[model samples]
Target: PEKRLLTPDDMKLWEESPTRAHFTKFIIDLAESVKGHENSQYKEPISESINSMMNLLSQIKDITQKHPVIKRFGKVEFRDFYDEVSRNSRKILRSEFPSLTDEQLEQLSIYLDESWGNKRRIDYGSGHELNFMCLLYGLYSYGIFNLSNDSTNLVLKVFIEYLKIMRILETKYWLEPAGSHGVWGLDDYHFLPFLFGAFQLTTHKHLKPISIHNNELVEMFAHRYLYFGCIAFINKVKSSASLRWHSPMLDDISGVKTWSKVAEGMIKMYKAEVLSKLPIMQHFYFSEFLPC
Candidate 1:
């Protein structure tokens, strides 16, 4: 991996980088690709390659299943599962890109492993989320996904399973948001789920942004929609705090008139808050697949 973002000036380079242009565009396109889709059981007519990609990502759920901190959190059990994920990730991606050198494979696998969260700090945030996107985009550059295929399945399946694992990791291990902006933050651990989540609600004829306040509605539809599911999780995380008290960013969102506009702002926020932030992008790497 080329370590491009080193000094403060390096931040300027990322703003002009091809990697940024490609990845940011890729995410927005992927988000737009699922215009009418909603979350549910992943049972689409998937290809062999896509099936296994989802399968391998699903294994990330096992760390929480098999080694979750019974009480709150720790690294011993986490490290074991973490190492296993890294080693296996390379083996899987290597098969897909046979021309990848041992060195290049290291970067790709590290990107995937980074998605699991920080072992030392026990934290998860947009940085870790970006790592996951890079890995998938690497696969996209290598032809693992076709634009003509179903992207709804990509989010509903690939992203859903990933969110399940991260949420479990967050609550079970008590992962902190290293770059969290306190009450100004969108959510403690994610922006995409909220972004894509809001997008899922765009087609809802009756459900509006303020509908998130309805406990019965959120609970009932949480399983069927990413936006609702995220509101549910954020509710649990905030516990007794009122939305306006805990998440002012989200509080303002609850007043938004249109879910489509919410989704639109989310993409813009990702670019401004996530991709453009120097601290977050500092860990972002460049390789053959996701060129800089």
Candidate 2:
């Protein structure tokens, strides 16, 4: 599918969501993440950090508005928390990276807590936040990115590897099913979208659209999930509300009249075929199909 340039309205929709806000930052941060920060005298970090903070603040403000008690206790507490996180994070992006030096990543790891004494090693759920931090580092510094910096590289490498593995698994097992493996589902399908960002970083030849992969039937592997390719799928789905599994905000792709007919079909197919039958009440399961 052709990429639809997002209208101001589309950006507004994205500005309001949790994942999209982070993703937006991820994209914007790429400029700095390229290389050459260690010697810089200024510390802009990335505009995306401010953007992420603003979005989180918007959420906090909204919640505080609904329950004034939150304000009475401290309306801006969340902002302070965000500020703390962004402050140290920005220090790493600004003063540390750019030359691809070990010191930069090491200092960055300080914010992550060194010596493995941080409670997260004992507790398992720190993965997302750490992943976000690694992703931030990945987007901030180029060749300097390493798995051992704080285990973020390993975490991200694992996530990225999962995408390649799943793509092959889905192809050989689920999509084709000759030897057949256990199923991979829609929510598990996030890696394809993440790759959209990775392609920007690596700029590898095969990842380019004019390459052989695009000329072959293999293009369907990515296009089947989106317009344009994984990138389009990422932007379209991330910006739209339909993919939200639940909460009162659940949106239907069929209700998205702004999309082209083909886009609507893709969105509808995800919902009707993939989301609805999941063990969770999502748009990923097949049991919710409506008879034509």
Candidate 3:
């Protein structure tokens, strides 16, 4: 069966219903629940599974970065690397889940494939971010992450590994930022880290969300926190531009009083900017849990 492309009217309906609130609260609870736990909590096969996925990312990156064409032709040759990554990822899936039925493997392939930035389009966007989250969500729903025992580890470890590889891809290939509002949008390649990052900060309760406006604080805490991780990426990618002038939206967020408030606002903004926009949503593969 063909996956449906979500329409603008579908997004309208989503905005008009409890479905939106349900998913928002769901994410909030998921993020909040993961506090206080470390990635080391995940055990056995699950840990191995995650390590394998991360290793696969590393392997693909190593192979792609070393490709002579990338050095010779730059971004124009990235398509070849993208194809190689796709092919390699499928093999990883089959090897990682040899027990999965053919149908299940097929579906998993589709979901996992969504995590890769578009090869033909040569861009990365919120849609690609959403797809990766969906892949993890699918894995969790299939009982791969053992959420009851260690949801925190999944976020801190597995998701963070995903982000690391993605950042590598964005930087190495010079992938275009899809649906970017330039510096006006929250981040070029992602929104989840900010949400999860805030959840980590929410545990502190004293650090103001606006604190991210300071370069020193961002540099000091970026390694320790996901929000700072985001800021560091912005600093790296948008090195020349004045953050205050260019990323006005994020600059304005610095005025917000609390990290929790910022998290709430992020949810609302993600709902409006990423979830509801047909340009992004159209690429999302709808499912029973996320039907249009």
Candidate 4:
């Protein structure tokens, strides 16, 4: 399982791999999974596994906070910080769940470490974002989250916190968009948020896709909803560009009306943009957790 996907034609074999099947089903299930939950609705108390994972994400964010990249010192400084965080987090992951076999931890190690942005390229995008999802999906497969509510916590609590750190990495270290489609893409440096973010809003009766235009509405709901946070982030970074110009894909999505259609389309779009594309998948590693 040493980086099986090499060339564009390799994607044909990847289509038959268990890794592909698992994620294909995983994405479809996730689209259906969030059907009933709200962005704000977590169960009474978070499970120990999910809670510990939350703490891990919180601690990882501290690395970026403690080490800011200055003009004089950039990735030269950031790489050291990222390396330290990656080591400790991987160590802590094994410690937190001693039940894992050596083989299992090996794969989880890849998933865990790769979830963060690439160290060499210093970029982040849907592939890295998808690796993070694999980590959560691996957790679920191992019975880490036995209950269905655990799925909600995985995205809302763990994944969102991960995004916060990623934004910090992007802004602080000038992390590039690994496989960006430029203005035509949904968002640079990320895509999973848009997909899950759609799930966060599908249940809303009043709020539709077009609400992305209303600044005040996005501000009001950004904290409660992941989708709004995405729009707000775009607004914050690209203050000069109009929504329709800089992010035409999302702007086009805004015209679709319902969140549910957007949710379904995001899944289909992710497959085409991130999953099916060999350039991104070529870097995707395979291990016991996600077999080749």
Best by lDDT: 4
| TM-score, one value per model | 0.89, 0.24, 0.84, 0.91
lDDT of each: 0.75, 0.30, 0.68, 0.76
Candidate 2 stretches greater than 4 Å from native: 1-24, 28-99, 107-133, 136-162, 165-186, 189-251, 258-292
Candidate 3 clash pair list: none
* Per-residue lDDT value at 91 in model 1: 82
All-Cα superposition RMSD per candidate: 2.6, 19.6, 3.4, 2.3
**Given candidate 1, what's the lDDT at residue 123?**
76
Off by over 4 Å in 1: 1-4, 41-44, 68-76, 92-104
Alpha carbon lDDT at 113, candidate 2: 29
- What tens-digit string does per-residue lDDT give for candidate 2 at 1-292? 1111333344344335454344334433432232221111122332333333234323323332332223311123333333444444434344433453544444343333211111222211112222334444443434433322322222223223333333432322222211111232323233223222322223322323222123232244343322124433333335533233321111232233323332324334433332222221121111101100
Better of 3 and 4 by lDDT: 4
Pairwise TM-score winner, candidates 3 and 4: 4
lDDT of 4 by residue, 1-292 (tens): 3344467678888777777887778766665566656666775578788777877777777777877666422365567666876787657677777777766666676677777777787777888888888877887788776646676677767777888888777778877777555467888777887888887778888999999999999898887788888888889877857897667898999999799899989988887778778778887776656676
Better of 1 and 3 by TM-score: 1
lDDT ranking, best first: 4, 1, 3, 2
1 or 4, which is superior by lDDT? 4
142-186: candidate 3 lDDT, tens digit per residue: 555555554566677667778887887777777777755545687
- The 10 consecutive residues of candidate 4 with the worst lDDT sum are 68-77
How close to the true structure is residue 197 of candidate 4, measured as C-alpha lDDT?
Answer: 81
Among the numbered candidates, top TM-score falls to 4
